[PDB]
């Protein structure tokens, strides 16, 4: 339920996904990240829990070329680096 402020590179990704706010909950941040991956079709077409984020700004933040939605720790580690707790 805590409010967070994304750092600029993360906020840019959320903005592409349609976010107009500057303060979010963690769940809302995760929501817009999924929206971004979906709109850009970064998920693997055959095994859709795999996300291929290499060569995309999201991969620069996550620091991995791909991840599994079922092994979300790279996402959470990125959030710790990119969220200011308010």
């Amino acid at each position: 339920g805590t409010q967070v402020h994304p750092r600029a590179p993360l906020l840019q990704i959320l903005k592409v996904a349609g976010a107009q706010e500057e303060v979010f909950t963690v769940k809302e941040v995760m929501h817009y990240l999924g929206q971004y991956i979906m709109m850009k079709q970064l998920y693997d077409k055959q095994r859709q829990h795999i996300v291929h984020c290499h060569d995309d700004p999201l991969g620069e933040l996550l620091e991995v070329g791909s991840f599994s939605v079922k092994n979300p720790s790279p996402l959470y580690e990125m959030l710790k680096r990119n969220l200011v707790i308010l």
């Binding site: 995760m30 999924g34 979906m38």
Partner: peptide, 14 residues
């Protein structure tokens, strides 16, 4: 499942 379904499962956990 679809990506939307997998992400919704993850989202619920946050």
């Amino acid at each position: 499942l679809t990506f939307x379904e997998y992400w919704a499962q993850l989202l619920s956990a946050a």
